[PDB]
Amino acid sequence: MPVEFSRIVRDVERLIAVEKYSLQGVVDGDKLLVVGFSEGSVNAYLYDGGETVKLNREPINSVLDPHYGVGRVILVRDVSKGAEQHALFKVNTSRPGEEQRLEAVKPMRILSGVDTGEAVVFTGATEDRVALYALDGGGLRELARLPGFGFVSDIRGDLIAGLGFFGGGRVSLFTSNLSSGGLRVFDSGEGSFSSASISPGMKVTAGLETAREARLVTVDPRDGSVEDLELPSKDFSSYRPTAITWLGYLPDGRLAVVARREGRSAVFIDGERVEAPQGNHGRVVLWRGKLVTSHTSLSTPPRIVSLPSGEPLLEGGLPEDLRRSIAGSRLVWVESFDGSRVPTYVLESGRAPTPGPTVVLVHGGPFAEDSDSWDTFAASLAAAGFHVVMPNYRGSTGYGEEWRLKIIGDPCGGELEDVSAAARWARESGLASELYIMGYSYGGYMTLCALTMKPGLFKAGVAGASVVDWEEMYELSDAAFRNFIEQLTGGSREIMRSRSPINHVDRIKEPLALIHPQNDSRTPLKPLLRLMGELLARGKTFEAHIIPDAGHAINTMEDAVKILLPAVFFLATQRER
Amino acid sequence: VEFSRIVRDVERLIAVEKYSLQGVVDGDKLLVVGFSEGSVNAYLYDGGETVKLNREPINSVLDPHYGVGRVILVRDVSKGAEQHALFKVNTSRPGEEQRLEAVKPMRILSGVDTGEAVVFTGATEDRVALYALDGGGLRELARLPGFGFVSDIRGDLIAGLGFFGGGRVSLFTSNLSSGGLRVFDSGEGSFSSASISPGMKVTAGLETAREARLVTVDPRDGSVEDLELPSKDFSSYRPTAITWLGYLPDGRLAVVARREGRSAVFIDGERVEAPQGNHGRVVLWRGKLVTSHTSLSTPPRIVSLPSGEPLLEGGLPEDLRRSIAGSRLVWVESFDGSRVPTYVLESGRAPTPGPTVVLVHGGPFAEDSDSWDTFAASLAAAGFHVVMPNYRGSTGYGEEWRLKIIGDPCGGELEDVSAAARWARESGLASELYIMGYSYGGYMTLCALTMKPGLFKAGVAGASVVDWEEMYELSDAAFRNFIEQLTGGSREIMRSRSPINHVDRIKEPLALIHPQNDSRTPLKPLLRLMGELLARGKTFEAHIIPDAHAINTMEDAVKILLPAVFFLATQRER
């Protein structure tokens, strides 16, 4: 019967250790710029000629998008031990591992950014404002104050094109001018914008995610007119995509698009489909004349491949015994309380019987999805001998504006019912002998709402980086996170309070593991402390694990282990009974 | 060094078979108990091969008389409620257990099997009592004033040790035929062990405020006097503790005595060569002396004297034993001219100088001896030297050194801990210093990081006490009293020696490891600490776990030990 701890650790270790890559662009002529988790930390690399050079010294969080060929990379690094107050560091690509901090920019939550080579344009959130900034030889400039999370998408000449969460959970398109500043906002009554790119004719080509469909559109930023984009191949509209992951013009004028349906993507160049390995893909770049994208799946860790051969340039290798810890995967449609079909990804473990111990692993966000993409949490549960049920509850991306916007104004409501229906299905399908719930971020919120609102549905609960109290979280949030909490609770304090697990602790009847980074600035620990005070006060059984010098965005293996390992240890111990 | 490597070693150190010598049976075979992950078994050892005596696991075995053709097992028949039953097993038919149904289930405390009867002590709902079991059923020889333990029998004379009142362990005697009780006080002393001479006097160890004394108590009149021995090695040892003493079947007296955290074996006062560390009982077997042995670098095992060859010893891989590279005693100079006896367990996986943890023992009235300690061993295995200082308040170095902590917590004893750290860097052992500790040790960790910041690179406080004032208020009279005496009934001391009132001064990372639902170590004040840590931007790690007793199983280790080692291993790489 006994939990095999050293095996679990080794497996959890190797799944975190395995290298993971992200495609960020091309620099210095023909050098892939890739961010990768490798040698234990998140780092920036140049790839070319079957070799890598490491650009950074200390671990980083990401880099700004370089337009093709710049001659430098801008690193983004948390200088607040996890609280996501980032700084910018220039690395000249001819002198790798020598960084010059950009002292003009005081630490802030960097949201996005582009480096045109003559200037660096970025969006950032501070305690009082979200804003589009520009930094050049003439110092730093505030181009525009943004009403909510904003993300720079592209820049051509002086035109700047961005995406903005400015109300209702809807995404707006925005533009600005690199020299004169300003802000123009474009809303759609039909839906939300997904990706933007500026055409050679200075029009913004954008994805537009409508009720249950997605499509491409052209916005002229002079007059705000919106028309459909005709493409010279019809494969794109034949594919009838539900969401758009990414689009961008290549240096040769061709429009690359990556769109998806049902948690798998397809690549298109001027509308034509290009052969791509199955799963999901990231951005597409043109390098030494050939197409390159990132690729991932439930069984393959994020890697970098060439299209259409699908052959890898960089890729982390899984050992066969871990490969087999995933017997298979499947997308099933669970019927929820209101009749809605909740599209649910299922990983069958090769170390669990059927029926067997199953965990309902809930995604964060909530504007995120479970898809055919590598998930370490999920793979490690497989490894430990749990089947894994991953419900794309309402609020999820990937299934249309309608399903995504149903969560707005109703946290701990319909989306919890979706999760619950996924649990019920797990048993009734034959898959589950017992149910556990586990989740990070908003998914940890679900765990806590699961255990307060649905006592006795689940056997035990892991809640990481959780939301606990909307009210106290709001007070401790930066401008951008205040606006989003507003957007998500529909500006209601009643919802804020009533839909906070902390005010319902007396109903918990199940064991509960809490995991939290001490310096998380999104989901802070202060409320989690008060929750423990409540649990204790009311005679409830829990364990807690607070991780030092870390926040919501984990960028080292050690932090990754401290986050993941107590979850798996706790679930394995609960399986003993 | 990745965590999985640490975990595997920790699993092996937890799982290693530890051995305890119980006596000799079946004519000429050892009766030994094996413990592994807190699961106990009884064996017969002779000539390499060993045979399990019991079926399912047990709590312990009764003390046999030399040669008896059976062993009496003690097993909890209630899943953990400590209401045991007695099970006889004839030494010629192992694996076959006859329950002794005349003895109703009860808290078995001790017992001796003469071969003709089973004499034992046990607690029921309404008493502690001495019993005898023989062919005609169960009898109560005596109701006892408190918990009592049978140490020996010879003829009709029964000798034991009572926790009968006055903070001192008394000697008692009873009679196997007529029953009854006779208590023998010790004025300013406490008995540690008893055996009965051929001449029908009680030899006993009498521990005192200073040196220990081997005495004879005549049970006919309670006269007590020093026992002169043929060889004067024993008087020369100037022992401070007397672990065990018993007469061998040839009439000679075996004494196991302690001094400075190690032990020596004597036979009619003459000292025998023995492996360095601490020894349990001695028995004559096949004409040779045999004892149990433990040290900081070796798990409890059975060895022959004077050679020290292990007869039975739990397997560890070669490199793991060699990572736990020997112990020594150093006398560390403290702030007031005092020398703190301090045990050091060098790591074979550490350079010199190299990373070093000061592992502060709990209590405070406890001792760090040359004895097996999983915590220390695990730290050595993960490449830290370990330094264990017997700070003032400790036991094992006379009453005076123990009473110096009274009215001075986070004072003299903290200086001792510091001096040990001072000593570790000064002598060349330590390149960098960490402090770690549970219970009072945990309090010490919190005290060191607040009062002496810049001393240790990082700290682990387990089952710590954060605030004397808060804790005094939410606690049972038993504990209120202890606190009152420790802090000298002074609120100034209670407030000022509570590290929660000095969180500001913390400068290095702190790991907290705490039980979630234990009244001796409540969680509430620890949450205040966590709140204060967080408000003031201090780096800390916290592991709060439910049901977090001592560490026996691997589960216990992961709940209480693994987080410490990982935290320190993580801190080591800056």
From Swiss-Prot, chain B:
Give the location in the cell.
Answer: Cytoplasm
**Which residues are annotated as active site?**
S439, D518, H549
Q: Name one GO cellular component term.
A: cytoplasm
Q: Please tell me whether the keyword Cytoplasm is annotated for this protein.
A: yes
Q: Which SUPFAM superfamilies match?
A: alpha/beta-Hydrolases (SSF53474), Peptidase/esterase 'gauge' domain (SSF50993)
Q: Report which superkingdom the organism of origin falls in.
A: Archaea
EC number(s) on file: 3.4.19.1
Give the reaction(s) catalysed.
Cleavage of an N-acetyl or N-formyl amino acid from the N-terminus of a polypeptide
Provide a Gene Ontology MF annotation, just one: omega peptidase activity
- Pfam families on file: APH-like_N (PF22173), Peptidase_S9 (PF00326)
Keywords recorded for this protein, A-Z: Cytoplasm, Hydrolase
Name the enzyme's class: hydrolase
GO biological process: one example: proteolysis
Q: What is this protein's function?
A: This enzyme catalyzes the hydrolysis of the N-terminal peptide bond of an N-acetylated peptide to generate an N-acetylated amino acid and a peptide with a free N-terminus.
The family note in this entry says:
Belongs to the peptidase S9C family.
Q: In its UniProt entry, what is this protein called?
A: Acylamino-acid-releasing enzyme
Give the taxonomic lineage as stored in the record.
Answer: Archaea, Thermoproteota, Thermoprotei, Desulfurococcales, Desulfurococcaceae
